From a paper:
The Dictyostelium discoideum dye-decolorizing peroxidase (DdDyP) is a newly discovered peroxidase, which belongs to a unique class of heme peroxidase family that lacks homology to the known members of plant peroxidase superfamily. DdDyP catalyzes the H2O2-dependent oxidation of a wide-spectrum of substrates ranging from polycyclic dyes to lignin biomass, holding promise for potential industrial and biotechnological applications. The overall architecture of DdDyP is similar to that of the typical DyP-type peroxidase superfamily. DdDyP contains a duplicated ferredoxin-like fold domain arranged as a β-barrel at the N- and C-terminals of the protein.
Here, we show that expressing the DdDyP peroxidase in ×2 YT enriched medium at low temperature (20°C), without adding heme supplement or biosynthetic precursors, allows for a correct native incorporation of heme into the apo-protein, giving rise to a stable protein with a strong Soret peak at 402 nm. Further, we crystallized and determined the native structure of DdDyP at a resolution of 1.95 Å, which verifies the correct heme binding and its geometry. Native DdDyP peroxidase is crystallized in a tetragonal space group P41 21 2 similar to previously reported structures, with exception that the X-ray data of the current crystal condition can be equally processed and resolved in an additional space group (P43 21 2). Moreover, the crystal unit cell exhibited significantly shorter axes, giving rise to about 35% smaller cell volume with 52.8% solvent content and 2.62 Å3 Da−1 of Matthew’s coefficient (V m), indicating the presence of a single molecule per asymmetric unit. The native structure of DdDyP accommodates heme b in a hydrophobic binding pocket flanked by the unique β-sheet at the distal side of the heme plane, the α-helices of the ferredoxin-like fold domain II and a distinct long loop at its proximal side similar to previously reported DyP structures. Our structural analysis shows that the native DdDyP heme is hexacoordinated, of which the pyrrole rings of porphyrin contributed to tetradentate chelation via their nitrogen atoms and via the conserved His222 at the proximal side with a distance of 2.11 Å. The sixth coordination is provided by a water molecule (wat-184) with a distance of 2.79 Å, which is shorter by ∼0.1 Å than that of the reported Fe(III)─CN distance, indicating a stronger coordination to Fe(III). Wat-184 forms a strong hydrogen bond (∼2.2 Å) with wat-182 and a weaker hydrogen bond with the catalytic residue Arg239. On the other hand, wat-182 interacts via strong hydrogen bonds with the second catalytic residue Asp149 as well as Ser241, suggesting that these residues may act as proton acceptors to the H2O2 during the formation of compound I oxyferryl thereby contributing to its stabilization along with Arg239 as revealed in other A-type DyP peroxidases.
Residue numbers in the entry:
A (entry chain A), B (entry chain A): 1 to 306
């Protein structure tokens, strides 16, 4: 019942299209056309899944709090949804956009086909795309830091439903809060660091990705910053982050997280960026966030009922 | 015996690294290091092929006429090799570089691994990369014009050896002349054209890629421009071109051709760009070349004997 970018694991390609809606709330013709294009997206997702099962195609269209009142007068706004720009006083790179199209695949050709077709359907008259990122998995699922990324990512449908999707019976059930954040890696600063420093920075071993016991890693290690609980509940999120960029140019990590609660994501941003104890994540000495947005991906039913 | 980017067909990904050699001919230490890095490339190619047969990994390192005398004092220069800048008086976009690293794969992760490892081995002290392109095949092997690309590409080991590789018994046998040319498509001009105009431009039907009989297509159609013979011999080339670019930005075709003779390629450039009859290829109304280089990919043996 959820849009298909949360529960599936280990995608090899991901295309990220972030931009603003150019249609106004009272433009009924434009709004009708816009929602016909949403329908076309859901249909083409199904079509590609049928002719290319090997692609394990997935796709979601997601919306910001700013735009919610424009795309629907029927579906209540998700209660936690807000602009990420409200974090600008302590987190750099914020750039809230109205719309996210996130498409995942095990093949670039079907990933690109769905992305290109969808953008051609919407057109420049409906979407002003501010950011288009072609993400791709690397050997051994390693981030460009050459650490494995995804180890303690929730595993399986049950746990990814629990932490990734709004719980059944709640408003906007089976939707998902979404955070996107493009990082630019400063590998010239990272590569020369000795192994012990690099592992102190992350909190896990580089080769095998074995968790360094919390007692022995710095509280500013990445894992210490993000492996959080509250009142005995783990604040786990579902990450679909992928590497991107040029070998000889700008590269980094296209971070994206899906969560049952925006607060699960925001608490980790507050931890990483000093807002809980006044200390920043050690990883941020080697990588910089340059974009950022909060969205909500409706369930498949509410997406079509907007 | 040839480097592995000519004979294999239907690659799904291709990474193109074009740049200049920063090591001088008398720098014996730098030259030794540079050739150790070539050896590492050939070895890593074999290693990846062994652990990932599904990738059908391929790779070639190629050299310009300008740099030939710098990388080897033993292997005679290929007799046709010259700078592509000598065509600048009639072909735009020329940008001759010393070195091409072309890597192909059916998986981006192994394609990127070999490309990144290789560039890290060479380093900025040995290569000044002017252009890095991530090519990828699209559904139905279609160019961004949405015409199928590759139909009359020579098919099979025998014909691709004949037209793609220097003939056995000749100097530099089993090497290959290489032409690279990045095109930027002007699809805003292309999309609105009626089907008959688009097919007149190419010379084949859009859906099925059926050749329009030469009698009925314009002499400036793309096929009429490039389907050439001389003294009864077809001047066929082996193309490994791939689409590239951003849906919402700059995109086009990363053209690359391998040939037994540079003249097979150059005659087609002369035809397309008006130097044979004073008429240009109709396709050039919708796409522009912005880079260009001639190289020669040595055989695997001569590559290691430089
Ligand atoms: C350049 C940016 C980032 C890089 C390179 C990076 C890298 C990594 C790596 C290598 C791990 C190893 C452990 C694992 O994947 O389970 C990890 C874990 C994790 N990351 Fe990040 N990450 C980045 C940004 C973020 C952000 C912005 C967040 C949250 C907003 C986040 C949340 C997490 C979480 C929750 C874990 C698992 C913690 C646990 O439960 O053990 N990451 N990350
Ligand atoms: C934007 C640039 C280009 C585009 C979009 C393009 C597209 C195409 C298409 C759609 C075909 C269909 C037939 C087939 O693939 O067999 C084709 C054929 C061909 N192209 Fe191009 N091409 C481009 C540039 C070039 C260049 C620069 C050359 C030579 C230097 C070239 C040489 C050929 C040849 C030899 C054929 C096959 C001709 C035959 O024997 O029938 N192409 N091209
Ligand atoms: Zn809390
Ligand atoms: Zn001739």
């Amino acid at each position: 019942m959820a849009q298909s970018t949360v529960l599936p694991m280990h995608c090899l390609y991901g295309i990220f299209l972030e931009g603003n809606l150019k249609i106004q709330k009272n433009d009924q013709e434009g709004l009708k056309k816009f929602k016909d294009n949403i329908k076309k997206f859901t249909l083409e997702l199904d079509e590609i899944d049928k002719i290319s099962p090997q692609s394990r195609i997935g796709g979601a269209i997601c919306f910001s709090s700013d735009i919610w009142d424009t795309v629907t007068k029927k579906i209540s706004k998700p209660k936690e949804l807000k602009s990420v720009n409200t974090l600008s006083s302590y987190m750099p790179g914020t750039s809230q956009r109205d719309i996210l199209i996130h498409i995942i695949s095990d093949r670039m050709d079907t990933c690109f086909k769905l992305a290109q077709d969808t953008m051609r359907n919407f057109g420049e008259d409906q979407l002003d795309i501010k950011q288009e990122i072609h993400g791709f998995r690397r050997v051994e699922e390693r981030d460009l830091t050459d650490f494995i990324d995804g180890t303690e990512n929730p595993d399986g449908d049950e746990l990814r439903t629990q932490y990734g999707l709004v719980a059944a019976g709640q408003p906007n059930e089976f939707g998902s809060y979404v955070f996107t954040q493009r990082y630019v890696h400063n590998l010239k600063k990272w590569y020369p660091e000795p192994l012990s420093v690099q592992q102190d920075t992350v909190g896990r071993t580089k080769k095998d990705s074995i968790e360094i016991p919390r007692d022995k890693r710095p509280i500013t290690s990445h894992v210490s910053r993000t492996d959080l609980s509250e009142n005995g509940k783990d604040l786990k999120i579902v990450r679909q982050s992928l590497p991107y960029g040029q070998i000889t140019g700008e590269k980094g990590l296209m971070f994206i997280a899906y969560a049952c609660s925006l607060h699960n994501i925001e608490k980790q941003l507050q931890s990483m960026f000093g807002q809980l104890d006044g200390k920043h994540d050690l990883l941020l000495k080697y990588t910089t966030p340059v974009t950022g947005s909060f969205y909500f991906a409706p369930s498949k039913k509410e997406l079509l009922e907007l």
